[PDB]
Ligand binder design. Structure first.
Ligand SMILES: [Yb+3]
Ligand SMILES: [Zn+2]
Length: 610
């Protein structure tokens, strides 16, 4: 009764399980390689085990040692994005539950899809280079040989040699630093992760980093030039940790540090344990994008403690975490705000479903990733169809206090484990046994397995949304002789969040007439806003509405940062505008070599430029 991880080529957890990784490596900026040894402590789950298979991607293997002697191994043919399977022949057959240590000597490729190597010119300080990883979903195999499946959890320790002017950090507790005895131009940084984790949570950064304390268990890390602004921007972090602990139970990870990466970091935030990674596009100056912090914090329960068994079940990670995120922000800013953000998320789902099409398999809640790259299937669907299901169930079963009791019991039940949608569903029924007649009203096949918008829409408070819709509708319904009526005062009682939702509402009906968009800049001066979420939607509205003056502004945002949420749609919208098409493509081609490897692939696909 085992389950299949169709994104991994390694032996499954039913055959063998990695219990620990000891990584010893050196970061070579002249070669853009990580070189070292991965010592995997492996437990047999079978009688008479005589071989096993690991995932690899663009790794060079030097040798494999067990019991102090080299052993036979073979690398199979590459399977596209999944990489190449590595079969290791064990020297003595293992009994069930026997544990051995396998030490693999390897080197990464400069093209490693897990890594971006930055030159000094690409950093803030301009003197030193920089390295960062991103393993979720299936890029840990492009760093080191492993069972690259979230169905397996392991502890780890590491020693990382770097040029002595730089700092290494990992998703782990810091365990000291020392000069490298093999090379006095280097330092060795040590790390320990004593909580078992899925390997997609392994993370590394190397650069000219400094730290500032912002709470009792939190330092923010960045280059010098960003430290002061980051400490302010993220100053709600400890209050959010305290709320999260109330909702999910104790925080088990020791430290909660934050790392603010350079602008090409591909995501808004990644929940690497003990060291969340975030985009610098969160530095709005007013703490207004802190829901991304609340999301990563929440993963310290839903995701890092309770984990999806395979990426087909990614909605478990994300839906529950958006649910908790929105509760943290509702406790800080009020229940009307929670419903505002919830309703907005439904808008996002509407957008995503229209983009893929209402029958598309990537619009199912549980996806089948057989032969699909997870990076391509990735979308807002698991987040927002997931959230919508849990919000619907909250309403069905008695409200937020009652549903939060379920969430905490779910985290407790499945801590340190990896689970499927059916495990989740079974526990829901158990917990809610005295409401099973309500539960049986749910159309489970449609919500879990059908494409498109869900079969039923929750109920949402409208208080904070109403002014956004009203203003949007005034603009959409305006004719030329109404344009004079608009004025800066129209925005005076709108928060940044409400201005963003006004633009989202308006973008859903784009294009508008060019003269309307010019009027908007004349009276609202949106070109002056630096909030990245607001600028992104404004520039999309401008390019879809065929305003040539917006072309250079959209090109610049698309290239001067690399969060894919912003760069992919800006490039797509520029390619679709005939006036900007040729330049969009020439700009992608010019920048491709120095982009994040996954962002480069996905922008190329989006533009049909191979
Ligand atoms: Yb009129
Ligand atoms: Zn997440």
């Amino acid at each position: 009764p085992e389950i299949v991880d169709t994104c991994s080529l390694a032996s499954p957890a039913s055959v063998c399980r990695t219990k620990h990784l000891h990584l010893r490596c050196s970061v070579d900026f002249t070669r853009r390689t990580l070189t070292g040894t991965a010592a995997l402590t492996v437990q047999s789950q079978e009688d008479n085990l005589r071989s096993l298979v690991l995932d690899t991607k663009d790794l060079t293997i030097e040798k494999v040692v067990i019991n102090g002697q080299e052993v036979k191994y073979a690398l199979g043919e590459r399977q596209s994005y999944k990489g190449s399977p590595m079969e290791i022949s064990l020297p003595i057959a293992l009994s069930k539950n026997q544990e051995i240590v396998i030490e693999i000597s390897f080197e990464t490729s400069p093209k490693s899809s897990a890594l971006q190597w930055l030159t000094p010119e690409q950093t803030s300080g301009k003197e030193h280079p920089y390295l960062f990883s991103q393993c979720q979903a299936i890029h840990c195999r492009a760093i080191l040989p492993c069972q690259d499946t979230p169905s397996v959890k392991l502890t780890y320790t590491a020693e990382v040699s770097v040029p002595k002017e730089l700092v290494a950090l990992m998703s782990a507790i810091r365990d000291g630093e020392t000069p490298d005895p093999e090379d006095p131009s280097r330092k060795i940084y040590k790390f320990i992760q004593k909580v078992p984790i899925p390997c997609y949570l392994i993370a590394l950064v190397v650069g000219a980093l400094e730290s500032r304390q912002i709470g009792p268990r939190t330092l923010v890390w960045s280059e010098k030039e960003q430290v002061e602004k980051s400490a302010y921007e993220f100053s709600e972090t400890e209050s959010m940790l305290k709320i999260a602990e109330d909702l999910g139970g104790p925080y088990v990870w020791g430290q909660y540090d934050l790392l603010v990466l350079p602008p090409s970091f591909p995501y808004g935030g990644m929940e690497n344990p003990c060291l969340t990674f975030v985009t610098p596009t969160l530095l709005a100056g007013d703490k207004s994008l802190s829901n991304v912090i609340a999301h990563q914090i929440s993963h310290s329960w839903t995701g890092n403690l309770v984990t999806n068994k395979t990426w087909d079940h990614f909605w478990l990670n994300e839906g529950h975490t958006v649910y908790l995120e929105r509760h943290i922000c509702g406790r800080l800013f009020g229940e009307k705000f929670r419903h505002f953000n919830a309703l907005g998320g439904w808008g996002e789902l509407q957008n995503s479903v229209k983009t893929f099409g209402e029958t598309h398999p990537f619009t199912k809640l549980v996806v089948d990733l057989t032969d699909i790259d997870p990076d391509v299937a990735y979308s807002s669907v698991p987040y927002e169809k997931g959230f919508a299901l849990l919000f619907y169930l909250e309403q069905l079963l008695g409200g937020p206090e009652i549903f939060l009791g379920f969430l905490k019991a779910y985290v407790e039940k499945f801590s340190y484990k990896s689970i499927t949608t059916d495990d989740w569903k079974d526990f829901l029924y158990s917990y809610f046994k005295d409401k099973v007649d309500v539960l049986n009203q749910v159309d489970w096949n449609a919500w879990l397995y059908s494409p498109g918008l869900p079969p039923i829409k929750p109920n949402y408070d409208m208080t904070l949304t109403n002014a956004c819709i009203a203003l949007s509708q005034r603009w959409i319904t305006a004719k030329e002789d109404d344009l004079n009526s608009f004025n800066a005062t129209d925005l005076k009682d709108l928060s940044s969040h409400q201005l963003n939702e006004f633009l989202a509402q308006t973008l859903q009906r784009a294009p508008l007439p060019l003269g309307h968009i010019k009027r908007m800049q004349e009276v609202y001066n949106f070109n002056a806003i630096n909030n990245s979420e607001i600028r992104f939607r404004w520039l999309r509205l401008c390019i879809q509405s065929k305003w040539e003056d917006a072309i250079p502004l959209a090109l610049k945002m698309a290239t001067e940062q690399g969060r894919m949420k912003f760069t992919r749609p800006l490039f797509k919208d520029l390619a679709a505008f005939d006036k900007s098409h040729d330049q969009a493509v020439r700009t992608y081609q010019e920048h491709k070599a120095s982009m994040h490897p996954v962002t480069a692939m996905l922008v190329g696909k989006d533009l049909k430029v191979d």
